[PDB]
Each structure stands twice: as structure tokens, then as C-alpha cells.
Amino acid sequence: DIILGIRVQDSVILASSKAVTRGISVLKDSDDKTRQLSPHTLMSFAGEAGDTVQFAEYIQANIQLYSIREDYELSPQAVSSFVRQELAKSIRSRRPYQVNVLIGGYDKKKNKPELYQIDYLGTKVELPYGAHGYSYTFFLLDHHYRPDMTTEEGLDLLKLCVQELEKRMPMDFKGVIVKIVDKDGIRQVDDFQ
Amino acid sequence: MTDRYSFSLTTFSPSGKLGQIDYALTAVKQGVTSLGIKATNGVVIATEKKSSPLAMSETLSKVSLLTPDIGAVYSGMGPDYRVLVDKSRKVAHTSYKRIYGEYPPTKLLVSEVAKIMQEATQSGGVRPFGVSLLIAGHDEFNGFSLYQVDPSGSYFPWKATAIGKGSVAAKTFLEKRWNDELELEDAIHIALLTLKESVEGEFNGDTIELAIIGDENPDLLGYTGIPTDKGPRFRKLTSQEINDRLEA
């Protein structure tokens, strides 16, 4: 499982590989490693088996409960803080499990996009771009990223990163599902990466 | 499963008053008088050691040190006061000393005692405490302080006050005898004068209990060698000192 995310001037673009478990051949067309926390906050996750899915569904349930109770939407910063707290709590009495999450949102009070990354120990970092699962896309991101890039330029950079990833992976890598979060909500780029 | 709960022992009356708290206040009003006076450089706390003639007065003391800088006195039921004093001494260490490395300021310890007393009114197992407390203390950032705590758990700061059987007359005397320029010795003299009108029998050093919060006492520290180690500020006057002050 590999996840990528780029925060461009007015939106956040999250790309997740539509991979599958090993040993069983599956034909499916869905993004199973992404949960919509709120109509303007999306979370992508990567890691080991169903522990990560359990954690993501638990987070989604808590955030939906908050939204129903307050008739209001939490900001991406508060959502990321809550996720970090819950992830730190979940491993206080058990062996830690591999998990890495990218949270992308659009704050309407501030009217700006935000992107956060939390690792398996519960370390939250606010980043303009991030990735997980890749053994380098960092240099490509560093050389070709600007804070005021539009959505199209971010998509072009994402396509370059996808090509770089696919040049060193077998044909078993079916593709990457791409989603965009902006002031109009969350949408899916049905065309390509 | 009717034994998993007990109905409240303290309930509201139709007029809007909690009867058990009022009756505890009545029991407080039937107790021996105890007073406190706050000065510019100290606080005085006084009480009458009403007693059998064969009972040793020194064995039973109504004035207790809570911290080296905080002491207390009571009017009402003695055993409740003893239990509360033990709890307050323990709480000064559990909540403050083992956390911040310091003894608590007077107001926070008063708040802890008041919370403990308040919890006794929201109960189906115990009745409220039947005591009123006067707590005097000193702390670095607030100076000298004197507080009164009621059986309901309410507490208030005072320049000077009195509780017990002769509280009204003592309050009148203190109102007519208090100024903002008073000194610790003047406060001690005024406390002796106020207690003189309340005690009915023998009025000497064997029937009066006095304590002060004043300057640090290096002689009571028990060790020497650390200049920054302040001595205790709480000090209980002996019977001889009380006799000397009464004679003068």
C-alpha cells in the first residue's frame, strides 16, 4: 500500500493505490483505503491488515457523531489532532501496528487547504506534500513544487510521480485512485491519475 | 437490588432550605467560642479549652497545625474536627507536596477542606459534618490570610471573626476594635480581651488556647546548615506565655 498527497494553492489532492491482499486474486473497482471523515475532510491510510481499517472506521464514526451532535463541522486541524490522540491511545497497552495516515481538508473558516501526516507512533506533521510506502519521489516533489500551484499543475506533478513509481514496479500495480478536496467538497478524478 | 442505593440524607424543604445543614449550623452555634484576628504582620487564633477537672488539658488541643505555615481551630463537634484535620494534613501532601515540592497556599487547602465538607451533604450514607473551622495561614504570594469554613462547605475570608456560643458579642467587639494598622501584639491583646468576656469560669493559661502565624522560627526547624530553609511560621503559645500576657 502506497499513499501520496499534495496540497496546492486552493485544494488537496490525495492518491491511493487500489492494491489488494496477497494470495487471493480479486476483481474490484473501488477505493478501499480511503474514508470520508467529513464533507470537507478526507483521510487516506496505509499499513497492515484489518487493524488499520478498524481504526479508520472508528475515527469516521466518532467524527460523524460529532457532526450530528453539534450540527457543525470540525476543522481539519481539530480532526487531525483527534486522530493523533486516538492513534496514540490505541497503542498504549498493545504492540504497535504499522499504520500511516494522510488527512486532507479545506478549512472554510480560513478558506484554505490543509494537509497532515500521522505515522504509526502518533507523530503529526503539517506538510505541503507527503508520501508513504515508497522505497525517489522526494526530489521530484522538491524540484517541481510551488506554494501557489493550481490544481492542474498539482495533477501534472502527481502524474509525474505516478510514472516514476510505475517505472520500478511490475504490471501487478493496477493503478492509483485520485481524489480532490476543495471548497466544493470531495470529488474523484475519474479520468486518470 | 434495593441495596445498591441509599436515598439522600440531606433534602430541600418546601421553603428552599437544606434541613441537615441548618441543624449542623445550630450544633455549631452551641459550641465553645473560637475567634481569629488578622494583623499586618501575623494572624491570631484563639479558643477556650472548656472541659472534667481531672482531665489533663495538654492532652487535648483544639488548635492544630496543618502545615508549618497554616493552622486551624474549630467550633462544634470535636471528633468531626479531628477527622477533618487528619484528612487535611494528608491532602496537603497528596495533592501539593508530592506534585510541586511545596506546601499549598492557604486558600487552596481551605478549598480542599471545603470540598470534603461539601461532599458530606450530597450523600445517602453520611450526614454533614457538625463543625465550623477557622483557618489561618501565610504564603509567599498572598501574605497572611484568615478564612472561615461552614458545615455546608462555604468559606469566606475575614479580617477578624468569631464562631460559637458567643459569636455575636465577640463580632461586635472585634468590629469596634479592628483597624488596618494593627500589629500582632495588639491582635493578641484584643483576642485575650474578647475571650475574657466569653469564658465563664477560670480565665488563665490553663483554659485558653492561642496560636499565631507570624515570623519564621529557626529554633523549631530541628536542624541547621541550609540558609534557604525557612522555619515554621505556626507557633502555639505556652500556658506560661499566656499567663504573662494576662498579668501584664
Add this chain to the structure above:
Amino acid sequence: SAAGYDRHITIFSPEGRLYQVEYAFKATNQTNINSLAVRGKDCTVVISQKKVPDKLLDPTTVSYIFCISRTIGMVVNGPIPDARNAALRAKAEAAEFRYKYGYDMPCDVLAKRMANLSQIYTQRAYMRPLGVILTFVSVDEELGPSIYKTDPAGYYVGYKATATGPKQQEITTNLENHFKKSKIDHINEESWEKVVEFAITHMIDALGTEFSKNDLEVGVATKDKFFTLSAENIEERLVA
């Protein structure tokens, strides 16, 4: 009459009193027995009146004086079942103090502990106070001869000398007169036998009646042990 829920439980009356506590105090005088406690230079003496009107009773099994620890003795005024309950509790408390703090429990500390338990009884709705009065005596290694008393109200205090019972006022008055004459708080004697004889004489003078060897119980606390005298010892003490 309590006239309310205070007929059963320990809550405040409108006058601000606890009627169950006062009724336990009244119960403390059921046995109609008087006890006296005095201090010597290095001993403490307790004397309890024994009444066995029934001829079918075994007198040797009638006693209100208990040995709590090696150095602490106790006298109880009130019914014998509560007395035995309190005796077992006090024994356990003394042993636990020794286990926890590494030295023998002082008499005053034990009295304070029992008083705190009595305070629990006074404040809890579902616990009744014990209708007894306890008097602990010893020779403490720091304070010398010691007498302390605890009551159902949770009040405890120490005494130069004490008397408890229906006729306690006369005994206390006689003790006060003797102490005013001597101008000391203790008995100026060197042997505990002399202190025992003095306490017997004081009891006889106060009650206005003569006592035989079977009408009294005597306990003596020294710095080593607390021990109870037998019939022969009391008979020997009477002859003086």
C-alpha cells in the same frame, strides 16, 4: 424522644443533637458498675466493682478488665457483648500498629484510633455506635503512667485519675479533694501494692460501703507488663 428518623439513625435533630449517641451513652450504665483509675510514680492501677448476685454464676468468668497488649490494659463500662467486641478490635489494632510501624503502640494513640472508629459510627447511617465507655491504661515509655478514656461520641481525653459509673460524681469529687490536698497530679508511692491499697480505700470511702475479695477486680500496669490480680492478691491487699 427523637421524634423522627433519628429514632433509628444518627442524623441531626432540629436542636442539632444526635439522639442515638446519647442513648448509647445511657446504655453505658446498664451494668450498674463503677470503675476507678489512678496513676502512681511508675505504675497505673484500675479497680472495677464486681456484682454477682446470682449464686449459679461462676465468679471467675465475670470480668470487665481486658489485656489488650503486653503493656496496655483496658476497662469497659457497659454491656459485656460490646465490651468483648471492643476488646478484640483493640487487640487487632495494637498488633497491626506494631507490625506497621516497628514499635509498640502507645496508649493514647490506641485511644485515638478507637475514637476515630467511634466517629465513623456516629456519622454513618447504617452503623450503630457501641454502648460502652473504654478506659486504656499503661506505662508509656515516653509519657510514664497514662490513663485515657473514649466514649460512644468519639471523644477521647487523658486523665490524671478517672472514675466511671452511676456513682462517678462522688468518686471524682473525692479524687479532686485529695489532689487539692496533695497538690500533685499523681500518687506519691514507689510500689504498686501501695497504690492498689490507696485506690481500694478511695473507692470504699467514695461509695460508702465495704468490699470483700470477691467484690472487686484489680489491674496493674507497669513499664514491663499489664497484669490482673487474682482473688488471693486482692485479699492480701485488703489486709492493711
Add this chain to the structure above:
Amino acid sequence: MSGYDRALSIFSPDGHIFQVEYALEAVKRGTCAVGVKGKNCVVLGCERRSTLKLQDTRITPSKVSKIDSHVVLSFSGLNADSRILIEKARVEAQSHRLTLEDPVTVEYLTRYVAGVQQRYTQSGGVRPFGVSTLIAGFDPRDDEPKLYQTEPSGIYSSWSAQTIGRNSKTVREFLEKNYDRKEPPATVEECVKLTVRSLLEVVQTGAKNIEITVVKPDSDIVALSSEEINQYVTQIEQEK
């Protein structure tokens, strides 16, 4: 009464539990609530007490609460207990969604609320909720309107149109005269108009004391503004 009404666990000689009836009496003192379901929607109407001059109206809670994106709830009785019930219902909806991946049905949520209310009648140390609730919505992936009523005893029922609270008998009679189950209001406007006309039978001031909420399939919940309710009231008055 007759000494049979001082506990929840006492049967009357004629087989009644009077405390449940008294909780219903408490419910009867709350503001009236009405629920009417049409061919393709459910409308919940509520009576609101006239707002005071200095009372802030921006953040005042509404009488109709959204349990989930497809289920809404109104109440009559004690306002403070309704908050506890609503919080529990929302928590249960999220918990069921987490456990089974599927959102609750209206009947399931009604049964859960009734179960909570029943549980709060099974102890002598607890007080039942003095609230009667109306739960409305549509089952997921379904287009059949659902309306249920729940009572403090834990009993729930399914209704085509129902009223609870103060003066609910008059509104129920009006609905019985002016509602036909075989020909329900085929449009949202007709259902809203019927609900408003039913509420106007007991509401004194008029439009400003009426709240209307409309629920449609596919998680479509709309809270009508004061202007629309005023327009409905004016049209009803003109047609009168």
C-alpha cells in the same frame, strides 16, 4: 394511590403501575408535538412557547432533533431528559453503523429508545424519563415513510398520524376527522398544510409559535423557515 403509588415495582390491586401514569401526566404538561406522514414524506410539527423580549433566538435549540441523516426525533415533556435521550440515540445510531456497516432503520432506533426508557423504570433508585417521543424517517434504500411513538414506560407504536403533549386530544380529534389512511396527502405541501392546520387548533398566537420539519427519502431533511410557515398560515386563514 391507596399506598400503591410510591414505587415503580408496585402493582395496583386492579393491575396498574401508578408511577407510569404519573410520568404520563408529566408528559401531558409539555408543548404539543404532531407527526403526520403522507404518500412520500413525513412532517413533524411542534408548538413553541412565545419567546421573551430579551431572549436570544440565534442558538436556542430546536424542538426537532436530527438523530441521523435519515431519522429525526421530536419530543414532549421534560426538556432536560430529552437531551439525554437524544444523545443516547445518536450514539446508538453511530455504533450500529460502525458494527454492521448499515445505518439503523426507524423501527430499530425506536426500539432502542423504548429499551432505554424501559431500563430506566427497573430500579427503585432511579427516575423514569418524563418524555414521550415521536420518531420519523425512512429506512435506508427504501421509500416507505415511518412514524413511531414512544412512551416513558418503554412501549412504542406505529401511527399514520399522532399527537402528544398539552391539548393533544383536540389535535388528535382534528386529525381523525381530516385524515384518510387510504388516501394520504400525495404531496409535501398538502401534508405540511394539514400539519399546520392541526397545530393552529391549540396554538394561540399563530405562525411564530409553529415549527415544521419535512423528511423525504434518500436522507433529505428540511427545516422550514418562519416565512414559509407564515405563508401557510396566511393561506389557511384566507381559505377559512
Add this chain to the structure above:
Amino acid sequence: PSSINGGIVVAMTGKDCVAIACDLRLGSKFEKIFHYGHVFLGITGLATDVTTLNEMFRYKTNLYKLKEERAIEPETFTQLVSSSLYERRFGPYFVGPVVAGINSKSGKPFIAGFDLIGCIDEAKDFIVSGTASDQLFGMCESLYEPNLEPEDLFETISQALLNAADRDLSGWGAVVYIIKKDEVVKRYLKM
């Protein structure tokens, strides 16, 4: 970009002033120094533990100010940090904390350091935390002088940080706080 574990913290005492400085990863937000009114805390080590400790100490200092009706002093905060660290005796945080400040009533500067379970090291000259450079302690020992003015103290600590950075490069920066009885100055170093 998400690797922020480690770092260094340096605290030094001058005349009626203190200095506390930390390293920072810059280039193309996460600072390891926090303050609680007039007490400064710098934490090195695991980043998640640093965030957790900062949140907990903000919680406790806010409650302390609400109750005592006054700001907390460096000595009291040091004792609080020690007790909080010792609470996790068998599951300790992987952190090295350093405290700096000026006592309001007395005006005396104060610095201290802690181990992972709260043992207090109160130093009169300087405290170094972190394992990024072993020669940082030696450079601080060679550069430090007692009773320096705030400008001289700032120059000394900045030079120590710059030399340590040159010892071990692009994107490195520093944050320096100079603290007096009534004035606090925060500066950034891009060299």
C-alpha cells in the same frame, strides 16, 4: 519531511538573563521550544512524546493559573515536570527536557535538565540536550563564560549552535530566545 525526531537544545545563564535555543529543519513549523507565560521548556527526542508532553504541560499550567490566580515559577514548574515524568516509571517517555526562566519575585535566572524519569540536574552554567553532536558539549564548554550580558550571551550561544551545525547541512536553522526579567526576544538563525 515527516522525520523530526532528535534535535538539540542548549540553555545558558548570563547576568539577569537566560538563553534557550533549539535546532530546526527548514527549507521547502515544528519547534521544540514552548513557553507557559514566563517559563520555557525545550524537549528533545521522540516527536510524539514531545507533542504529548507539551499538551500535558499546557493543560496543567492552565489549571494551575486558574486555581492559584498567578503564573507558575520556574522552580515549581521544574518540580511538576519531574513528578509528571516519574509517573510513567515503567513506560517512560523518550525525551530529554530542559527548563529555563527568570523568577519574578527574586529575579534570579534558572535553568535545569531532566532524565527520562524525572531526575533533576540543576546547573549554574549551561545545559545541553540531544545526541545530534557529541562535540556540542565541548564547544559549549570552550565558549561559555560566567556573567555575560544578553548581547554577549546571545552571540556565544549562536556561535555554539553555528559551529555545531557546521560540524555535522542544507535547510538547518536555529531558534534562540533571550529572556530577561521583563523582556523576551525571539530570533531566527538561517546560517
Add this chain to the structure above:
Amino acid sequence: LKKGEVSLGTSIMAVTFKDGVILGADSRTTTGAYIANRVTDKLTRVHDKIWCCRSGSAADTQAIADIVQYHLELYTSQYGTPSTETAASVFKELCYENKDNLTAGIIVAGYDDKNKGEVYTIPLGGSVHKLPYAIAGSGSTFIYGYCDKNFRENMSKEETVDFIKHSLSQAIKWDGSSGGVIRMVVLTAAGVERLIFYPDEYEQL
């Protein structure tokens, strides 16, 4: 058994004789090869005429002995002077019920008016054995034969003192974990008598 824990490499003897019982021990406590304490007192008193010596873990045996002394005070408050058998039973119960977590062995010597002096041994594991005499510790292994050749029933006090002195002198001579002075307690109807013998005395035997 626990890592970095103080052990008891002692020499312990208890002998029953005509007038009562005598308990003897050395006075050496070591940490590996270093002697941590050369004048330690190993004769533990749990009642006025009931004494014991301990082997195994020092902390575990000290805790067990404290609990036993507390138990005997509780018993005395009720029924008077306990018997040596009762103390041995309490020791055995404490050792056996905790044998999976504590390492403890106890030699108990007692006197009472009924049984007139008794010795009990509770080795590791928690079993109890009543014997006319008992030896224990790391230095006991070297005197198994000698004692078996020199013990007699109903010996006088002086003969028992000499037997214990000789046996413990040999145990000290051959065991590196044993040394110092020899301490003995004599329990009879007359009372409790404490004795000490110095190296310059018993090394010339």
C-alpha cells in the same frame, strides 16, 4: 533466585538438650566474594522463647519472619504463649503457599512448658521436619558426618555448647561464605541466655 538479590550463605545449627534448646549461627553476610557485613546477627526472635534462623533470599525471609511475629502477637493476645509447633506451622504455611515466588528456608527453635524444647526445619519447597537437631546453610554440608558422630540425646548445657562450637568452627573453617563470631541463644525454663564466641577462641579447638 531473583537477579542481583542478597543471598544467605550461612551456617545454622539447632540442638535439643536435657534442659531445653540451643540455636547457633555464624555472623557473615557476603555479596559474591566481598564480605558485606562481618558482625551481622542471624538469630531472629519471633517470640520470647521462639527463635529462628533464615536461609535463601534475605528479603523474603525477613518479610516472612515479620508476618510470623505479627501472627504470634495476635495469637498471644487471645490464648497466651504459643507452642513451637504452632510457629512452625505458620512458617510452613507461609513458605509453602509462596514457594513459586519466594525462596525461603527456616530453622525454628522453641521452648515451652509442655514440650520442653523443640527443633523444626523447613527447607526450600516448604516441607516441615521435626528433628532432635538440625543443620542448614552452605557450610552445613561440611559437617554432616561430624555431627552424626557426636550428637547424643539429653546432653548437658555445656556439652551442647561445646558440640555446637566445634561444629560451627569446622563449618567456618571450610566454607568461604561463613565466618566471624559464633552467636548462640539458650532457651530453657530459666529464661533466654545469649552467648558469643570470638575467632581467637574457636579457631584453637
Add this chain to the structure above:
Amino acid sequence: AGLSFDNYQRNNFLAENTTIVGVKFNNGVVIAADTRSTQGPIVADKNCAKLHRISPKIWCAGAGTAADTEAVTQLIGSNIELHSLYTSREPRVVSALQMLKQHLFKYQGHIGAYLIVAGVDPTGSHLFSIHAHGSTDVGYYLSLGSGSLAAMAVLESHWKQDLTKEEAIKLASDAIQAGIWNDLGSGSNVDVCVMEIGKDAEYLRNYLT
């Protein structure tokens, strides 16, 4: 409640990837220590106070895990102060020893504190050694720390029953000095505390410099 076990598994997963003496003299006791505090081979502090006060006349000095030593000493001091207030009597060294022994035994050696405790009470003068697992011992002169062997050699050289206060102070200072000279763990200064029967405790900071 109590000491927490949270993040034990997490810490395991991450891992997978001084001279102190006490001397008795004819009318009291003396405790002494060095002032060097190190963090590995680096001298962290040249003037560190290692003598701690359980009660005004009961003092102690520890080794092992420093945080454990400080925490246990402070907890026992709080218990001693509360007990003294409850009994209205001067605290006894035996009581502090009992509390320390039972507390250390409860944790089964996981609290790494090794102590020398000296004190004066109405029963007399007392000196004790306390091990981490809960065992305690009595002695006339004791040593502790990495320099304990040199200090013990000096103590065995010049100890006798009839020691005055000055002789005891000199002997303790000499033992600490030997540990200072011959052990890399010690070396800076000598702190002394003298507790004499019937008098206040005397704390001499940097008695030898």
C-alpha cells in the same frame, strides 16, 4: 492509579528496532558523601548534594537509580511527617526503616534504590543499610557506592568503640577522601551531616573542599 505501565509494549518494540559512609560515635551518628555527579564519563556537576533529609533528625544517602532514590526518600519523608503529626511524637528511625523495607519489597526489586539511613530519636542513635529488594541490615559503620571498597578499607583501619564527635567526623571525612582519590566516580568535595543525641542536626556543606 499509581505508577503507569502504559507504553511498555511500545518501548519494547522501539528497543527491538559515588562514595557514601555512615559512622556511629558514642553520642550520635555521622553520614558523609562526595559531591561529584556524572552522566557517564562526563562530570555533570562538581558540587552536588547527595545527603537527603527524611526528617529533621533522620537523614539518608542513596545509590542506584537516582530518580528512584529521590522519589522513595520523599515518599517516606511525607509518610513520616504525617505519622509524627498523628502520634504527636518525634519520628523513630525504626519506623522509617519499616516503611522503606515494606515499600521496596512490594515492588520486588524493580525500584533501584540502595540507601544508608542514619538518625537520632528518643530511643537513641541508629544506622541502617537498605537494599533494593527489601533486605535491611544494622551496623556501626557502613559504606556504599562505587568507592565503597576504599572507604571501607579506611573505616576498618581506624574505627573503635570509643569515638568522640570530632574523631568520627575526621574518620568519615578520611573515608570519603579515600573514595575521592582512588575512585573515578568520586572526587570533588565532602558533605557531612552530624546527628547528636539531644541536639539539632548539623549539616556541613563542603566540609572538605
Add this chain to the structure above:
Amino acid sequence: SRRYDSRTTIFSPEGRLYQVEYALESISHAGTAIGIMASDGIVLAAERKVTSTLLEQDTTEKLYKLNDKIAVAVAGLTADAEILINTARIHAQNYLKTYNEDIPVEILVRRLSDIKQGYTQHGGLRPFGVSFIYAGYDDRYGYQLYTSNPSGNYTGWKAISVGANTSAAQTLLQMDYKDDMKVDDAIELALKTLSKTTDSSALTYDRLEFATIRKGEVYQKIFKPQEIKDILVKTGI
């Protein structure tokens, strides 16, 4: 009523809860407190129940700070109020720790009201005999004024009074309050309402507590006795 008022968990035949009603009635014996929300701030005022000059007026019986944005005025039993105030402070700090943001006013009010409601549903608990006026600011609704009573119900207000003279104070506020009022006008209105509704001869400074939540950020100011005297002189009382 004597057969249905001894316990808090029993309904009357008419559906009433008498213990809750008695707790509500007990509020009328407390000193008056007033909250007024203007276009640019909130004013809290209260009258102490002082009867002697020996009280330390300078050194906190009616006004408390829940946090830097939220404060409260208290009418009723002081100790129960202190319990609830400590609980509210802990809840606010918990929200800040969890979400890294300041807690909204309504959430804190609802939490406290739920606690007070729960204290009316257990037979072993009596209701809290306190009423709170909450004054706060948040980024969602701006300035907010709330009231909560022993029954656990809470309400939003523009101008509100609790305590002994609630009816007359509310009448005066209705006759005088305006939507576009300023902070200084709100202060004057609160002082005049307290002076008119007081049972004492004069409204001196030592019988008053004052607080203001305003903007320069948002600032809380608990007035000292000297400032209270200055404002009393300025108003003309």
C-alpha cells in the same frame, strides 16, 4: 405534597418533581446577578450578601473564570457552584487538549446542564442548588450569554438576571435594553438596575462584583474595588 417530596425519583400524581421545585425556589434567596450582552462585549454584575465590615472585600464569591474566553456569575450555594466550576474548567482543558482548540460556550453549558440534570435522576443525590449565568466568546457565534438552573435546563439571553429580584430587574432591563447598546451603556444599565432593585439604602462599591468580556483578541477584566468605585462615581450613583 408531603407524601411525594421526600425523594427526588418519584413523580407526584400531577406529574411534578417537588425536590427540583424546591431547589429552584432556593435560588430566590441568593444575591442578584445580571448579565447584559452588547454589540461589542458582555457585562456581568452581582451584589454580595455582605453584612459586616470585617469581610475581606478586596480578596471572589459571585464571579469566576472558566477559561480565558468564558466566565460565570453564580446565584445559590457557593460550594456546589465551586464543584461545578472545577468540573467545567477540567472539561474545557480536556477539550483544548483533545482538539487543540478552545471549547465552544454552548458545549460547556450543555455539559454542565447534563450533569445537573443527572443529579435529579438518582435517589442518592440531591439537586445542585445553584444557577449560573455564562458569558463567553467563540468563533462560531461570537458573544454569548446563557443561564442554567438546578433543573438542568439552559436558555440563551441578551439581558438576563437571576437571584432575589429577578422579576423587577427583568422588567427594568426590558424597559431599557437596546440591541445596538455599547459596553459602557451596558455597564451603566447594569449598575442602575442593581441600584434600583437593591434592598439596601445605597449601592456601595463593597457590595458589588463586576466583570467585562471585550476586545482590544478578547480580554477578560474582573474589576477591582477601586475601579468599581470609579465607575460608580462616573455613572452618578
Add this chain to the structure above:
Amino acid sequence: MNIVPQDTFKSQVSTDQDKSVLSSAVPSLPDTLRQQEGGAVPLSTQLNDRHPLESTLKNWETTQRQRQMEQYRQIFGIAEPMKRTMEMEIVNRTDFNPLSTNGSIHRDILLNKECSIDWEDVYPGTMVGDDVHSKIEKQLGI
């Protein structure tokens, strides 16, 4: 007559062992949302990799109390432990403070801890279900 706590390990497990957090939809399964443990904590993980001293510390006081009761039974009889247990049950049963966690004064007097402090006293210590009503339901067993 135990000193170190024994028999601390669990012998059987089930998905409904925690009766207080059972799911209403599937009563045989726990409700992970109301558990509020992070959502990724299976019960099996609590059976392995525990610190060996945790069980000893958690059950130490209960073990000492049980040993004291057994000693009382042996020396005094059944009545003494019966009375001690009755007093403790009465005190613990009538105390219900949902807003506080500190123990009662009377409990400390009964436990002879009036002037004793341990680390449990110094260190006595959500989105869903941490309110008064949850404590009411748990206390009343409804």
C-alpha cells in the same frame, strides 16, 4: 496466607466478557465505539506481552487484606472477618460521587491508612459515554 498475589491469569475468554459495553445490535459482540480505546484493541492482545510486575502491583493490597482476614479467621474466628467485611461493604456501598474519584475518609480509617501515602494516592489517574448517566447505570445495574 499469600504474600505475592497469585492466580492472576485469566482462564477463559469470550467476546461478551465485558458486560458493560456489549453491542445492542449484536449482543454477543462488544461495542467498539463506546469502548473508546482507539478502535483497534482486540481482547487477545491483552493476554500477551504484559509487564510481569503489573499484576503483582494491581492486586497487592487485596492480597494483603485477604491474608489479614485469614489470620483473623484462624485466631479470632469467623465473626471478626465477617464484621470487617460487613463494615467495608457498608461504607463502599453508600458512597456515590460521580464527579469525584477520591476515596472516603471512613474507608481510610477502616483500612488504617489515615496517615499513609502511596503512589496510588499521588497519581490517582471523552467523545462517548463518560457522563453521570453511565455511572448511574453501572451503579444501579440497569
